[PDB]
């Protein structure tokens, strides 16, 4: 039919991975979260309390509440021609920290370090801006070529 129970159409997204059944490792409980941190949502099918809805599987958001046992996560959801901010409570088995800012943090650190380095020696500051791949430059190649031909059918 068409019924829309809380867990409809979850035959594949809530199943365990191959040879990864059973209890979760203990790193999922003793890692530290702070307000404003970016996290990912991935549902674990062996834990049935604090489970988010199928819609939130594979989204990223920020922490707005640190609780005794659950976290509060803010997520942007599009509804028709508008975006709504949804706040949900998730238990620890369904949340992982997100590396969506690691590249920017490393870029900032490197930019500052390079700026410090050349100043002490006085060397000119290089360009600290990313470049989209530019066209190739002039160069010279050697020839030991192999003749290529088309085969018969």
């Amino acid at each position: 039919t068409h019924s829309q129970g809380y867990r409809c159409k979850t035959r594949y997204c809530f199943a365990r991975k191959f040879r990864r059944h059973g209890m979760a490792n203990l790193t999922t409980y003793n890692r530290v979260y702070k307000l404003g941190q970016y996290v990912n949502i991935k549902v674990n099918g062996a834990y049935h309390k604090g489970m988010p809805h199928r819609y939130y599987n594979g989204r990223t958001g920020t922490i707005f509440n640190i609780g005794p046992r659950a976290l509060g996560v803010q997520i942007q959801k599009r509804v028709r021609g508008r975006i709504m901010l949804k706040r949900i409570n998730v238990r620890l088995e369904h949340v992982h920290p997100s590396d969506c800012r690691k590249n920017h943090l490393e870029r900032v650190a490197a930019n500052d370090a390079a700026r410090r380095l050349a100043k002490e020696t006085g060397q000119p500051v290089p360009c600290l801006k990313r470049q989209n791949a530019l066209p190739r430059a002039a160069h010279v190649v050697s020839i030991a070529s192999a003749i290529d031909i088309t085969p018969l059918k």
Partner: protein
């Protein structure tokens, strides 16, 4: 004609357990319950009092769980006891009490190494003498400084009435550690309170002395063969609580650890060689032989 049970498909789909579970060392349910903390308490260390018992001695440790490992901040063993006045009878009830007391005193002294005012050692001085009664350090805890708190972890042992794990925990509590617990699993417990006399008797090895006396009294051959190490060192039933009290006083006086000396020995049993060219030779010869 008999079907094969462990087939190739059996191996393809097999999932191994965690390594420490395969060796039967840790119960991961209990550990998860023990090391869980409120998320709004962030990276604040949480300590458990770990007690283990081998065939020859007793181990006491205070450890904190980290992200990628476990951190030990104090450990006491039953080897050290002869260094304090107890040469024999290790791994029995009195020895467990003594090792727990040693661990507690050593941890408190290490914590108060430098501090001068309100040091954790001056405040919360353990019970002056072992009386075998219910004592709780947190009763009337100092407001400015609270007592060190740990949680007891038993492992795979059976938590029965009269077990030595609880003896080690009682010894640790007598040194000034705040370990939550009741008095149900101690030898003096009844439906209405409990009597410190039985606990005191056990803590001082009265049962061992009585057994030694009765055995030597009438059946002396079995006594000689069954208490060879006791008899060799000249330990007699009547002069037993005195030695235990002297050991308690000595431990409570200077409870620090002196490093023992030794050198490691690596045999050849693990020195056998790992024989591609050499492996490839043992097939050509066998093929030619056949």
């Amino acid at each position: 004609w008999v079907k094969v049970q462990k087939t190739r498909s059996y191996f393809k789909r097999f999932q191994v357990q965690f390594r420490r579970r395969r060796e039967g060392k840790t119960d991961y349910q209990a550990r998860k319950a023990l090391i869980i903390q409120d998320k709004n308490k962030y990276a604040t260390p949480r300590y458990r009092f770990v007690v283990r018992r081998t065939n020859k001695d007793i181990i006491c440790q205070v450890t904190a769980a980290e992200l990628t490992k476990d951190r030990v901040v104090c450990a006491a063993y039953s080897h050290e006891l002869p260094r304090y006045g107890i040469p024999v009878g290790l791994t029995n009830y009195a020895a467990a009490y003594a090792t727990g007391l040693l661990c507690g005193r050593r941890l408190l002294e290490k914590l108060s190494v430098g501090i001068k005012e309100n040091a954790l050692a001056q405040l919360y001085p353990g019970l002056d003498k072992a009386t075998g009664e219910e004592y709780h350090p947190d009763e009337n805890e100092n407001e400015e400084v609270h007592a060190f708190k740990a949680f007891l972890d038993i492992g795979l042992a059976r938590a029965s009435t009269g077990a030595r794990v609880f003896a080690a925990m009682k010894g640790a509590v007598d040194a000034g550690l705040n370990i939550p617990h009741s008095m149900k699993r101690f030898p003096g417990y009844s439906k209405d309170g409990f009597d410190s006399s039985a606990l005191r008797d056990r803590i001082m090895g009265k049962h061992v002395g009585d057994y030694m006396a009765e055995l030597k009294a009438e059946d002396e051959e079995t006594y000689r063969k069954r208490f060879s190490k006791y008899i060799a060192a000249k330990v007699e039933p009547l002069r037993l609580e005195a030695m235990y009290t002297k050991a308690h006083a000595a431990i409570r006086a200077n409870p620090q650890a002196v490093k023992a000396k030794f050198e490691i020995k690596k045999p050849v049993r693990q020195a056998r060689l790992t024989l591609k060219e050499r492996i490839d030779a043992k097939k050509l010869e066998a093929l030619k032989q056949l």
